Design goal:
binds zinc ion, two-stranded parallel sheet, 9% helix, binds mercury (II) ion, 29% strand, 257 residues, 4 helices, 13-stranded mixed sheet, mainly beta, binds ligand AL1, Carbonic Anhydrase II
Length: 257
């Protein structure tokens, strides 16, 4: 199956998922100088006050916190979006070293990790239908830089022991995702795809300008996860990120100057 190793990594994906060579693939490098400031861009509206977290799980690719998306409990509106998008889950991509880990880069600069809050367009009924549409998903990308500890991230860090290997999960209720947002909601936006197979081109990427900082020990705990299931040879979960793809016939718009 696909993964991030030499034999099943990104450079092999196209064989099983041809869309990997598509026209709007992610991530991409955000070139601040050629990004077009757009005044008609509305401010972002993240309403996560009623968010209901359910569980956290290691899926062999990354760890994911799933939310109850049965109702409009945590939605994203505004920005370049037309419609309400529901939060279904969030996950991270991180590196084996502090200078790599994020998927999107800024002027070729890589961050230690990158948080993706995944939302789907409610006008489509369910996530399954949303992934069949060019505007089916909206992923909020947030960069993580090493520095001071991020208090809202510690709850996730503590529970990682219980989900060390692929297939493990644990109840993770009452988690407030607002604890992971930076102060400013300024962003960049462009049409892209999922960064892992099936690599579907249904995503409106909203990448925040301002990164959040997390301590080295917090990201350290991320690296102690396992790609493998229990009983198999241990393989540390690190560098679960895909390299930048060519922008092609696309323009990155900024909501700020
Ligand atoms: C039909 O397509 C499906 C069905 C079920 C699951 C998925 N996903 C897994 C891959 C993947 C990669 C994401 S990233 N890094 O681009 O945010 S979000 C995401 S997903 O929605 O959780 C996709
Ligand atoms: Hg799509
Ligand atoms: Zn992701």
């Amino acid at each position: 199956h696909w993964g991030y190793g030499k034999h099943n990594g990104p450079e092999h994906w196209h064989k099983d998922f041809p869309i990997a060579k598509g026209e709007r693939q992610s991530p991409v490098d955000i070139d601040t100088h050629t990004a077009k400031y757009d005044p008609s861009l509305k401010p972002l509206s993240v309403s996560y006050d009623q968010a209901t977290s359910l569980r956290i799980l290691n899926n062999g690719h990354a760890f994911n916190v799933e939310f109850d998306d049965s109702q409009d409990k945590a939605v994203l509106k505004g920005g370049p979006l037309d419609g309400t998008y529901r939060l279904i889950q969030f996950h991270f991509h991180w590196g084996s070293l502090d200078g790599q880990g994020s998927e999107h880069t800024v002027d070729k600069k890589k961050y230690a990790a990158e948080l993706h809050l995944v939302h789907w367009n409610t006008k489509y009924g369910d996530f399954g239908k949303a992934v069949q549409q060019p505007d089916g998903l909206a992923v909020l990308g947030i960069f993580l830089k090493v520095g001071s500890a991020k208090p809202g991230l510690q709850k996730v860090v503590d529970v990682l022991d219980s989900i060390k290997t692929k297939g493990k999960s644990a109840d993770f209720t009452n988690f407030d995702p607002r604890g992971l947002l930076p102060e400013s909601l300024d962003y960049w936006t462009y049409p892209g795809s999922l960064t892992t197979p099936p690599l579907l081109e249904c995503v409106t990427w909203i990448v925040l300008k301002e990164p959040i900082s997390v301590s080295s020990e917090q990201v350290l705990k991320f690296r102690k996860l396992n790609f493998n299931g229990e009983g198999e040879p241990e393989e540390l979960m690190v560098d679960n990120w895909r390299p930048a793809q060519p922008l092609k016939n696309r323009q990155i718009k900024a909501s700020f100057k």
